[PDB]
CSV table of N, CA and C in Angstrom, one decimal:
chain,number,residue,atom,x,y,z
A,530,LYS,N,25.3,32.3,-16.6
A,530,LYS,CA,24.8,31.1,-17.1
A,530,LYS,C,24.7,30.9,-18.4
A,531,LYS,N,24.3,29.7,-19.0
A,531,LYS,CA,24.1,29.7,-20.4
A,531,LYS,C,22.8,29.0,-20.6
A,532,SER,N,22.2,28.6,-21.9
A,532,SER,CA,21.1,28.1,-22.1
A,532,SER,C,21.2,27.0,-23.1
A,533,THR,N,20.2,26.1,-23.3
A,533,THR,CA,20.2,24.7,-24.1
A,533,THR,C,18.8,24.3,-24.5
A,534,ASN,N,18.9,24.0,-25.6
A,534,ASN,CA,17.5,23.5,-26.3
A,534,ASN,C,16.9,22.6,-25.3
A,535,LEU,N,15.5,22.3,-25.3
A,535,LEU,CA,14.9,21.6,-24.6
A,535,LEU,C,14.4,20.1,-25.3
A,536,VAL,N,15.0,19.0,-24.6
A,536,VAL,CA,14.8,17.7,-25.1
A,536,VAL,C,13.8,17.0,-24.3
A,537,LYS,N,12.9,16.2,-24.8
A,537,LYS,CA,11.7,15.4,-24.2
A,537,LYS,C,11.7,14.0,-24.5
A,538,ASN,N,10.8,13.3,-23.9
A,538,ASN,CA,10.8,11.5,-23.7
A,538,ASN,C,12.5,11.0,-23.7
A,539,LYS,N,13.5,11.7,-22.9
A,539,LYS,CA,14.7,11.0,-23.2
A,539,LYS,C,15.2,11.2,-21.5
A,540,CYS,N,15.7,10.2,-20.8
A,540,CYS,CA,16.1,10.4,-19.4
A,540,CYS,C,17.6,11.3,-19.5
A,541,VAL,N,17.4,12.5,-18.7
A,541,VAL,CA,18.3,13.4,-18.9
A,541,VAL,C,18.6,14.2,-17.8
A,542,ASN,N,19.7,15.0,-17.6
A,542,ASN,CA,19.8,15.9,-16.5
A,542,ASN,C,19.3,17.3,-16.7
A,543,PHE,N,18.8,17.9,-15.9
A,543,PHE,CA,18.1,19.3,-15.8
A,543,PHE,C,18.5,20.2,-14.7
A,544,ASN,N,18.6,21.3,-15.1
A,544,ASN,CA,18.7,22.8,-14.2
A,544,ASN,C,17.6,23.6,-14.4
A,545,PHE,N,16.7,23.5,-13.8
A,545,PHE,CA,15.7,24.4,-14.1
A,545,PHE,C,15.7,25.6,-12.9
A,546,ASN,N,16.3,26.6,-13.2
A,546,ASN,CA,16.3,27.9,-12.4
A,546,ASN,C,17.0,27.6,-10.9
A,547,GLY,N,17.9,26.6,-11.1
A,547,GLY,CA,18.7,26.2,-9.8
A,547,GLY,C,18.4,24.9,-9.4
A,548,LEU,N,17.2,24.3,-9.9
A,548,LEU,CA,16.5,23.1,-9.4
A,548,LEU,C,17.2,21.9,-10.3
A,549,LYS,N,18.0,21.2,-9.6
A,549,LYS,CA,18.9,20.2,-10.0
A,549,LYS,C,18.1,19.0,-10.1
A,550,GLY,N,18.1,18.0,-11.4
A,550,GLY,CA,17.4,16.7,-11.1
A,550,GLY,C,17.9,16.0,-12.6
A,551,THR,N,17.5,14.7,-12.4
A,551,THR,CA,17.8,13.6,-13.2
A,551,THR,C,16.2,12.8,-13.4
A,552,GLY,N,15.8,13.1,-14.8
A,552,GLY,CA,14.8,12.6,-15.2
A,552,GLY,C,14.1,12.5,-16.7
A,553,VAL,N,13.1,12.2,-16.8
A,553,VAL,CA,12.3,12.3,-18.3
A,553,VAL,C,11.3,13.4,-18.0
A,554,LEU,N,11.1,14.3,-19.1
A,554,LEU,CA,10.3,15.2,-19.1
A,554,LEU,C,9.0,14.9,-20.1
A,555,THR,N,8.0,15.5,-19.9
A,555,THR,CA,6.7,15.0,-20.6
A,555,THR,C,5.8,16.3,-20.8
A,556,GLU,N,5.0,16.3,-21.6
A,556,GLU,CA,4.1,17.6,-21.8
A,556,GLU,C,3.1,17.1,-20.7
A,557,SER,N,2.3,18.2,-20.2
A,557,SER,CA,1.4,18.1,-19.2
A,557,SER,C,0.2,18.7,-19.4
A,558,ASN,N,-1.0,18.3,-18.6
A,558,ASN,CA,-2.4,18.5,-18.7
A,558,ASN,C,-2.7,19.4,-17.8
A,559,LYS,N,-1.8,19.6,-16.8
A,559,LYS,CA,-2.1,20.4,-15.5
A,559,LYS,C,-2.3,21.9,-15.8
A,560,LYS,N,-3.5,22.6,-14.7
A,560,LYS,CA,-3.7,23.8,-15.0
A,560,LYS,C,-3.1,24.6,-13.8
A,561,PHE,N,-2.3,25.6,-14.1
A,561,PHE,CA,-1.6,26.3,-13.0
A,561,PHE,C,-2.2,27.7,-12.8
A,562,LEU,N,-1.6,28.5,-12.1
A,562,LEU,CA,-2.2,30.1,-11.7
A,562,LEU,C,-1.1,31.0,-11.9
A,563,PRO,N,-1.4,32.1,-12.0
A,563,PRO,CA,-0.4,33.2,-12.5
A,563,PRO,C,0.6,33.3,-11.4
A,564,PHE,N,0.4,33.1,-10.1
A,564,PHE,CA,1.4,33.3,-8.9
A,564,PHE,C,2.2,31.9,-8.6
A,565,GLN,N,1.9,30.9,-9.6
A,565,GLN,CA,2.6,29.7,-9.3
A,565,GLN,C,3.7,29.2,-10.1
A,566,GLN,N,4.8,28.5,-9.7
A,566,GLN,CA,6.1,28.2,-10.4
A,566,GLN,C,6.2,26.6,-10.6
A,567,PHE,N,5.7,25.9,-9.8
A,567,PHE,CA,5.7,24.6,-9.6
A,567,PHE,C,5.1,23.8,-8.7
A,568,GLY,N,4.9,22.5,-8.6
A,568,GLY,CA,4.0,21.8,-8.0
A,568,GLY,C,4.8,20.7,-7.1
A,569,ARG,N,4.0,20.1,-6.2
A,569,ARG,CA,4.6,19.1,-5.4
A,569,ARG,C,3.7,17.9,-5.1
A,570,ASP,N,4.2,16.7,-4.6
A,570,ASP,CA,3.8,15.5,-4.3
A,570,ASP,C,3.8,15.6,-2.7
A,571,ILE,N,3.3,14.2,-2.2
A,571,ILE,CA,3.1,13.9,-0.7
A,571,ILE,C,4.2,14.1,-0.1
A,572,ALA,N,5.5,13.7,-1.0
A,572,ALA,CA,6.7,14.1,0.0
A,572,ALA,C,7.6,15.1,-0.4
A,573,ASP,N,6.7,16.4,-0.8
A,573,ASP,CA,7.3,17.3,-1.0
A,573,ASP,C,8.6,17.5,-2.0
A,574,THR,N,8.2,16.6,-3.1
A,574,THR,CA,9.2,16.4,-4.4
A,574,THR,C,8.8,17.2,-5.5
A,575,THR,N,9.2,17.8,-6.5
A,575,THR,CA,8.7,18.3,-7.6
A,575,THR,C,8.2,17.6,-8.6
A,576,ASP,N,7.0,17.6,-9.1
A,576,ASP,CA,6.6,16.8,-10.2
A,576,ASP,C,6.3,17.7,-11.5
A,577,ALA,N,5.9,19.0,-11.3
A,577,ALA,CA,5.6,19.8,-12.5
A,577,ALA,C,6.6,21.1,-12.4
B,722,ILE,N,-31.2,-28.3,10.5
B,722,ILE,CA,-30.0,-28.3,9.8
B,722,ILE,C,-29.6,-27.0,9.4
B,723,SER,N,-28.3,-26.6,10.0
B,723,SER,CA,-27.8,-25.5,10.2
B,723,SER,C,-26.2,-25.3,9.4
B,724,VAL,N,-26.4,-24.2,8.7
B,724,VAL,CA,-24.9,-23.7,8.0
B,724,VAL,C,-24.4,-22.4,8.6
B,725,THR,N,-23.2,-22.2,8.8
B,725,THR,CA,-22.3,-21.2,9.6
B,725,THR,C,-21.1,-21.2,8.8
B,726,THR,N,-20.8,-19.6,8.7
B,726,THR,CA,-19.8,-19.2,7.9
B,726,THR,C,-18.5,-18.9,8.9
B,727,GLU,N,-17.3,-19.3,8.6
B,727,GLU,CA,-16.2,-18.8,9.1
B,727,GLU,C,-15.1,-18.5,8.2
B,728,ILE,N,-14.1,-17.3,8.5
B,728,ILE,CA,-13.4,-16.8,7.8
B,728,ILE,C,-11.9,-16.7,8.3
B,729,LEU,N,-11.0,-17.2,7.6
B,729,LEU,CA,-9.7,-17.2,8.2
B,729,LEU,C,-8.5,-16.6,7.2
B,730,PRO,N,-7.8,-15.6,7.6
B,730,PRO,CA,-6.6,-15.3,6.6
B,730,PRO,C,-5.6,-16.5,6.4
B,731,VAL,N,-5.1,-16.5,5.4
B,731,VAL,CA,-4.0,-17.5,4.9
B,731,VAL,C,-2.5,-16.7,4.6
B,732,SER,N,-2.6,-15.7,3.6
B,732,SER,CA,-1.5,-15.4,3.1
B,732,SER,C,-1.2,-13.8,3.3
B,733,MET,N,-0.1,-13.2,2.8
B,733,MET,CA,0.1,-11.7,3.2
B,733,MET,C,0.8,-11.1,1.8
B,734,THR,N,0.7,-9.9,1.6
B,734,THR,CA,1.2,-9.5,0.3
B,734,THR,C,2.8,-9.4,0.6
B,735,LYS,N,3.6,-9.4,-0.7
B,735,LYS,CA,5.0,-9.7,-0.6
B,735,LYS,C,5.3,-8.2,-1.1
B,736,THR,N,6.4,-7.6,-0.3
B,736,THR,CA,7.0,-6.2,-0.8
B,736,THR,C,8.6,-6.3,-0.9
B,737,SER,N,9.2,-5.5,-1.7
B,737,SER,CA,10.5,-5.2,-1.9
B,737,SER,C,10.7,-3.6,-1.8
B,738,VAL,N,12.0,-3.5,-1.1
B,738,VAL,CA,12.4,-2.2,-0.7
B,738,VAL,C,13.8,-1.8,-1.6
B,739,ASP,N,14.1,-0.7,-2.0
B,739,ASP,CA,15.5,-0.4,-2.3
B,739,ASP,C,16.2,0.8,-1.4
B,740,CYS,N,17.4,0.4,-1.4
B,740,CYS,CA,18.0,1.3,-0.3
B,740,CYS,C,18.3,2.7,-1.0
B,741,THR,N,19.0,2.9,-2.0
B,741,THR,CA,19.8,3.9,-2.3
B,741,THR,C,18.4,5.0,-2.8
B,742,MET,N,17.5,4.5,-3.5
B,742,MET,CA,16.2,5.0,-4.1
B,742,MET,C,15.6,5.7,-2.8
B,743,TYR,N,15.4,4.9,-2.0
B,743,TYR,CA,14.5,5.6,-0.5
B,743,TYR,C,15.3,6.7,-0.1
B,744,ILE,N,16.9,6.4,0.4
B,744,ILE,CA,17.5,7.3,1.2
B,744,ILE,C,18.0,8.4,0.5
B,745,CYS,N,18.6,8.1,-0.7
B,745,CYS,CA,19.4,9.1,-1.5
B,745,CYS,C,18.6,9.7,-2.7
B,746,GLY,N,18.2,8.8,-3.6
B,746,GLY,CA,17.2,9.4,-4.7
B,746,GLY,C,18.4,9.2,-6.2
B,747,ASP,N,18.1,10.4,-6.6
B,747,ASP,CA,18.8,10.7,-7.8
B,747,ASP,C,20.0,11.6,-7.6
B,748,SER,N,20.9,11.6,-6.4
B,748,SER,CA,22.1,12.3,-6.2
B,748,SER,C,23.2,11.2,-6.1
B,749,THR,N,24.3,11.4,-6.8
B,749,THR,CA,25.3,10.4,-6.7
B,749,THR,C,26.0,10.8,-5.4
B,750,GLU,N,26.4,12.1,-4.9
B,750,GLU,CA,27.2,12.1,-3.7
B,750,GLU,C,26.7,11.6,-2.4
B,751,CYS,N,25.3,11.5,-2.5
B,751,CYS,CA,24.7,10.7,-1.2
B,751,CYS,C,24.8,9.1,-1.4
B,752,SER,N,25.0,8.8,-2.6
B,752,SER,CA,25.3,7.4,-2.7
B,752,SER,C,26.8,7.1,-2.4
B,753,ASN,N,27.5,8.0,-2.7
B,753,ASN,CA,29.2,7.8,-2.4
B,753,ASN,C,29.3,8.0,-0.9
B,754,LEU,N,28.6,8.8,-0.3
B,754,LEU,CA,28.5,9.0,1.2
B,754,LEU,C,27.9,7.8,2.0
B,755,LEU,N,26.9,7.0,1.3
B,755,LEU,CA,26.1,6.2,2.1
B,755,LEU,C,27.1,4.6,1.9
B,756,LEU,N,27.9,4.7,0.9
B,756,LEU,CA,28.5,3.5,0.8
B,756,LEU,C,29.6,3.3,1.9
B,757,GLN,N,29.8,4.4,2.8
B,757,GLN,CA,30.7,4.0,3.9
B,757,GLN,C,29.9,4.1,5.4
B,758,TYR,N,28.9,3.4,5.3
B,758,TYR,CA,28.1,3.1,6.6
B,758,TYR,C,28.3,1.4,7.1
B,759,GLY,N,27.5,0.6,6.2
B,759,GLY,CA,27.6,-0.7,6.6
B,759,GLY,C,26.7,-1.6,5.4
B,760,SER,N,26.2,-2.7,5.8
B,760,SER,CA,25.3,-3.5,5.3
B,760,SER,C,24.0,-4.0,5.6
B,761,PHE,N,23.3,-3.0,5.9
B,761,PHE,CA,21.9,-2.8,6.6
B,761,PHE,C,21.0,-3.4,5.3
B,762,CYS,N,21.6,-2.9,4.0
B,762,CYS,CA,20.6,-3.4,3.0
B,762,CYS,C,20.6,-4.9,2.8
B,763,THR,N,21.7,-5.8,3.2
B,763,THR,CA,21.6,-7.1,2.9
B,763,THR,C,20.7,-7.9,4.3
B,764,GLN,N,20.5,-6.9,5.3
B,764,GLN,CA,19.8,-7.8,6.4
B,764,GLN,C,18.4,-7.5,5.9
B,765,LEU,N,18.1,-6.5,5.4
B,765,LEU,CA,16.8,-6.0,5.0
B,765,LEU,C,16.1,-6.9,4.0
B,766,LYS,N,17.1,-7.1,2.7
B,766,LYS,CA,16.7,-8.0,1.6
B,766,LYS,C,16.5,-9.2,2.2
B,767,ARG,N,17.4,-9.8,3.1
B,767,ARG,CA,17.1,-11.1,3.6
B,767,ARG,C,15.9,-11.4,4.5
B,768,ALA,N,15.4,-10.6,5.2
B,768,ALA,CA,14.3,-10.5,6.0
B,768,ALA,C,13.1,-10.5,5.0
B,769,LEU,N,13.3,-9.6,3.9
B,769,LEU,CA,12.0,-9.5,3.2
B,769,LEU,C,11.9,-10.8,2.1
């Protein structure tokens, strides 16, 4: 694969480690743990 | 001389739904596949 700079606050396509999606990315105030990679909402769709 | 209270509902909240966002979401291939089923969306929209 290749790599590309990170853009924020614009609706874009993203491919994070095989996770494909379309949306806008924003800085987060959430706190994770060293054994976690991403979070989920009620409908088991990624949010962070 | 007595005063009594009665309560009666009148109205109800109004909702609207989107087909493609709920069923497919952010994937175009699902939309192109769903275009070949029917016109259930028209019926749902008319009822709502």
